[PDB]
Amino acid sequence: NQQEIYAAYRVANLLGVYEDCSPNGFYQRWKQKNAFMKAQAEEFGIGSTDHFIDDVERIVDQRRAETEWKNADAWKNGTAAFGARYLTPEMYLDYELKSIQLAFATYKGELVGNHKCHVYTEDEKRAFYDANQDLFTRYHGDLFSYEEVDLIIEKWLKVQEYQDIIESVVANTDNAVRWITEFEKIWNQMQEEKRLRGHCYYVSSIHGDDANDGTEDQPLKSLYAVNRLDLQPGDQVLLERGSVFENQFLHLNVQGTKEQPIYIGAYGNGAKPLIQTNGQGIWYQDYGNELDAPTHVYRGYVSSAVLLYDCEYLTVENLEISNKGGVFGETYSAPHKMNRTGVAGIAKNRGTLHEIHLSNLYIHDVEGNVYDKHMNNGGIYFTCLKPEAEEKTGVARYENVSVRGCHLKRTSRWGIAVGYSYKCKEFMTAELPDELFERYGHHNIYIADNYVEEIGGDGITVMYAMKPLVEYNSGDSCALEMNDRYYTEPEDRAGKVAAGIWPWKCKDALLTYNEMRDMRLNQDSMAWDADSGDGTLYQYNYSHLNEGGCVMFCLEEAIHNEFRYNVSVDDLGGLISPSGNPDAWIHHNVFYRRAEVPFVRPHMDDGKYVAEENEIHLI
Numbered sequence: 215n216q217q218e219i220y221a222a223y224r225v226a227n228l229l230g231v232y233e234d235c236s237p238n239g240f241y242q243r244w245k246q247k248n249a250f251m252k253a254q255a256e257e258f259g260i261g262s263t264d265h266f267i268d269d270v271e272r273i274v275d276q277r278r279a280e281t282e283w284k285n286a287d288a289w290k291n292g293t294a295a296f297g298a299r300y301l302t303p304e305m306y307l308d309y310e311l312k313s314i315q316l317a318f319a320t321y322k323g324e325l326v327g328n329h330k331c332h333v334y335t336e337d338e339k340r341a342f343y344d345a346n347q348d349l350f351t352r353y354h355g356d357l358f359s360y361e362e363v364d365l366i367i368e369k370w371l372k373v374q375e376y377q378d379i380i381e382s383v384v385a386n387t388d389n390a391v392r393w394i395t396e397f398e399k400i401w402n403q404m405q406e407e408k409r410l411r412g413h414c415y416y417v418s419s420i421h422g423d424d425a426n427d428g429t430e431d432q433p434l435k436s437l438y439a440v441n442r443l444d445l446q447p448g449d450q451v452l453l454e455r456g457s458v459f460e461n462q463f464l465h466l467n468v469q470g471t472k473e474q475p476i477y478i479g480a481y482g483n484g485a486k487p488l489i490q491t492n493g494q495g496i497w498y499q500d501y502g503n504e505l506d507a508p509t510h511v512y513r514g515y516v517s518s519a520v521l522l523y524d525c526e527y528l529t530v531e532n533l534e535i536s537n538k539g540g541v542f543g544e545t546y547s548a549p550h551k552m553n554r555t556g557v558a559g560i561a562k563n564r565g566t567l568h569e570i571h572l573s574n575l576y577i578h579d580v581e582g583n584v585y586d587k588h589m590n591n592g593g594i595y596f597t598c599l600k601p602e603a604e605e606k607t608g609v610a611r612y613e614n615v616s617v618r619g620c621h622l623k624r625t626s627r628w629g630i631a632v633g634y635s636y637k638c639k640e641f642m643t644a645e646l647p648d649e650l651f652e653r654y655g656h657h658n659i660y661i662a663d664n665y666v667e668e669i670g671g672d673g674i675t676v677m678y679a680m681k682p683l684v685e686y687n688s689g690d691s692c693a694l695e696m697n698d699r700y701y702t703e704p705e706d707r708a709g710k711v712a713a714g715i716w717p718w719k720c721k722d723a724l725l726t727y728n729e730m731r732d733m734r735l736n737q738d739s740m741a742w743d744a745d746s747g748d749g750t751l752y753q754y755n756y757s758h759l760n761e762g763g764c765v766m767f768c769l770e771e772a773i774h775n776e777f778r779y780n781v782s783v784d785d786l787g788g789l790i791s792p793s794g795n796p797d798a799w800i801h802h803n804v805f806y807r808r809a810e811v812p813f814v815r816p817h818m819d820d821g822k823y824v825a826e827e828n829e830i831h832l833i
């Protein structure tokens with residue numbers, strides 16, 4: 215809503231968040247941001263996947279072997295390059311609107327223009343605690359103490375005060391109309407620049423006909439027609455910009471070759487083609503065996519806007535996807551609400567699937583089951599099901615798979631999840647020998663340049679992969695539903711926790727050049743999580759105002775952990791959560807903490823760690 219955008223930049227000006235809070239000011243900051251990331255970030259993983267995807271494990275080995283803080287000076291004076299290397303207009307606007315809100319939350323001034331900044335008294339914060347007990351329970355139902363959530367409550371109350379100022383300015387509607395008229399022109403200009411950045415099948419919801427041959431002159435009309443095409447190596451399917459595919463879905467079982475991949479994309483002019491699945495695109499998921507915990511749901515119907523079922527040598531690019539529920543009989547937090555995906559990837563009957571790539575997808579309002587962790591449930595979820603006959607087709611798993619440039623907003627439960635496998639019970643040791651990955655695990659997994667925001671559960675998680683590279687991702691405001699207010703009927707599933715960007719049962723994972731802000735309080739709610747897995751390294755990551763702190767080392771199977779050359783600015787709760795972990799080497803980081811935010815997070819402090827040569831500032 216343009217009046218809310220206008221109001222936000224009015225507050226930004228009064229807070230001094232940005233020097234120029236005109237629409238041109240927004241445009242120049244966007245241009246500056248993209249030019250900076252292009253000049254200063256690493257080049258690896260930019261451009262065609264054929265030029266780098268085979269080198270992911272090699273670049274991971276090189277970066278893990280670094281012996282000093284690369285560009286330490288930039289990192290320490292606040293001009294390092296991290297987060298997504300290109301921000302779309304939609305990513306950038308949402309990022310700045312969140313920046314303004316968080317600046318209000320930490321503002322110490324008396325006034326914002328004529329608005330007197332409320333000073334939240336102990337009485338007022340304690341009253342909020344007593345009235346919102348459903349927000350302060352942990353994994354096992356035990357409450358955080360008031361003292362543990364005092365500063366988080368003040369942050370929340372200042373965010374509400376901020377939000378009330380926006381609707382107030384909106385209510386009070388001259389130069390607002392000027393500001394908004396100019397913003398629309400700038401927005402269109404930005405969309406024009408964004409847009410600038412076998413057989414060809416054309417599909418047009420507006421001009422097509424499913425009886426056509428599917429040329430640009432006589433395009434197909436519907437995704438159902440696409441679902442019926444016998445797509446061959448080299449084929450392209452191009453969806454017309456401006457198209458809306460109402461209640462439609464793409465369910466594909468197609469294979470290109472290395473030499474002639476299949477491409478799904480956009481053509482023409484206007485908005486990204488919109489797949490508006492609205493809870494249709496039904497299919498039956500079955501892992502074929504219980505998962506790592508017997509309580510995890512592992513079979514049932516899923517709604518997916520885009521289902522890639524045993525696909526290979528396929529790239530999907532430049533689409534907008536939603537998957538809203540709200541069908542008759544359904545409530546939002548219902549225990550068995552259908553699992554929903556924006557893009558679901560499945561490996562089952564073709565052994566290793568090669569060369570699946572998602573690029574520049576805008577996936578929002580995917581209203582999956584609030585609870586279920588391992589059904590294909592969230593914005594993007596790739597999994598591996600037990601093959602019909604593994605002795606004939608091989609272990610179902612992934613090789614050379616990338617998720618790049620995707621924007622996720624309001625997806626539940628997961629943001630981006632890649633790799634959960636029916637072979638999960640083969641990895642139930644602390645140490646994970648390389649042979650487990652040679653037989654059962656994924657190779658050359660690359661997740662980069664994504665923006666995940668307002669996510670029900672975890673932001674980005676890579677699973678069962680050898681040396682995955684998760685880099686140059688930006689995350690805001692994940693774990694929104696990991697609390698009793700939304701997580702109403704978990705039954706025996708537990709799982710009321712989420713962290714930002716992290717690996718599960720990976721070997722020698724590298725998470726680097728990521729940015730994570732404003733994780734929503736739960737027992738976890740830290741930015742980074744060296745979870746169960748072997749050899750995880752976080753380096754060159756930026757974290758800010760996460761309500762569960764900076765980094766966790768999670769229990770006895772989180773082994774060979776290292777956390778170096780990271781910057782943490784005003785993480786809350788407690789900076790490090792060494793929770794029952796056997797080791798963690800925490801060294802050569804820079805932390806900025808409030809005096810009343812401890813280095814070690816309460817109740818998550820009984821693990822083994824070496825913290826040395828860290829620079830801890832008070833703020």
Ligand SMILES: CC(=O)N[C@@H]1[C@@H](O[C@@H]2O[C@H](CO)[C@H](O)[C@H](O)[C@H]2O)[C@H](O)[C@@H](CO)O[C@H]1O
Pocket residue numbers: 506507587634672677711712713718738739743745746768769
């Ligand atoms: C060991 C542990 O408790 N780790 C937590 C994570 O929970 C595990 O996540 C994996 C995901 O593949 C399985 O679901 C497993 O059964 C869970 O125990 C949890 O997701 C993260 C993020 O909050 O943190 C740990 O608490």
Ligand code: NA
Pocket residue numbers: 564565566567568608
């Ligand atoms: Na294969």
